[PDB]
Symmetry: C2
Subunit: 234 residues, 2 copies
């Protein structure tokens, strides 16, 4: 099992706290430096929370599970063309494999893979996501490859820490329907993109990693948190 | 395994309900001296259909006039309503998928975990029959509970072209109230689920009960002829 010791959060003066339509509590920020741009969210996942299967085109993603418990789903197949949805009528639905995450496990998911996750437990579980701008991403306002812009556009702001905002039908539908604008094909129901869910995890998925880029993004976050003005987080 | 037709009892004022599982239902309950059941002629929009659940009060038939609908079904049975298919209870379960064909009839006895979805981009028809089983308590329509369930949790459709919006309370109740009506209903798709496989076991493929369906069709047909020895409402 590939683990990672810590992924810190850039501490903004005005944190952006969002309750996603996938029932996830996000503290999210965008960072960039000369050589890199990304979004990062420190998240809490209540029981049953997590996104339906989806595929990214503008970012590579890391999942870090401090307490494990999170069940991730991941394809072996890649879907390199955003215009071809992995649906029954078209190119065809995908085979996914489940990962029973362990404490401080680091999962790397390159662009074009299908993935998702759920908290299948009764605990409210921590997870950190890092979404790094890839080499074909268009330039978004925060130069991050589009993911914070997506969550900010689709998820209500948590203005009251002790009362989570109401999620509406429109917000749930938008979570899927706005996603392509941010280089995401996001399914609206669990079985839309999915053919099978198997528990025997192929070693090729299991082996995927990119610590070098994660370590660079950690240097950026840590620098921002020390007041270094050569990087920006906002 | 196919079935030629399952007719709908024609009520003066059909009961049209949009379920919190995004199903458009034309539903009724019927009973006669020996038998009680609910039936719905449904249209399932893209992505519609219930998340995995298990029945305690009924045996269920699914009939897919145009196929298309994808069903999910366990081999394992869960005979104790107080033991959920979750860590700590019975354990999360293995499901097997069924890609339905035209006029296919799928029989699902009580205690099996099942569900379905319309995975296509067009609305599809399905007919449900839920037959009151050996142990079901007595509900007002004597049907084993299913019509009372849907009528309690889901809104009436006042206009098929302008479907009612489901509320958060309705969706919550579809899960939370289900055990009162003899259903353990999951609130997210993978709650009760370990794996989903496309290799359909023969022990599931062979499930059938044409004899009880034929009895229930006879009740419906009799009701539709005006026979007062049976009731549909
Ligand atoms: Cu993702
Ligand atoms: Cu059922």
């Amino acid at each position: 099992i590939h683990t990672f010791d810590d992924i810190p959060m850039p501490k903004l003066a005005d944190p952006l706290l969002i309750y996603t339509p996938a029932n996830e509590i996000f503290d999210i920020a965008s960072c960039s430096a000369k050589d890199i741009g990304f979004a990062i969210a420190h998240a809490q996942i209540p029981p049953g929370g997590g996104p339906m299967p989806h595929i990214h085109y503008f970012i590579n993603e890391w999942f870090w599970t401090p307490e494990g418990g999170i069940e991730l789903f991941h394809s072996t197949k890649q879907y390199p063309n955003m215009d071809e949805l992995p649906v029954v009528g078209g190119a065809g639905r995908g085979d996914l494999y489940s990962i029973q995450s362990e404490p401080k496990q680091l999962i790397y998911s390159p662009n074009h893979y299908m993935h998702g996750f759920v908290n299948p437990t009764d605990k409210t579980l921590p997870i950190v996501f890092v979404w790094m701008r890839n080499e074909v991403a268009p330039d978004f306002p925060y130069h991050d490859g589009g993911m914070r812009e997506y969550f900010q556009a689709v998820g209500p702001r948590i203005t009251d820490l002790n009362n989570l905002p109401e999620l509406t039908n429109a917000q749930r539908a938008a979570f899927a329907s706005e996603a392509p604008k941010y280089g995401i094909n996001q399914s609206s129901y669990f079985m839309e993109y999915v053919n099978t869910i198997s528990d025997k995890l192929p070693a090729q998925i299991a082996k995927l990693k990119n610590d070098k880029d994660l370590e660079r993004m950690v240097e950026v976050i840590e620098a921002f948190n020390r007041g270094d003005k050569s990087v920006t987080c906002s």
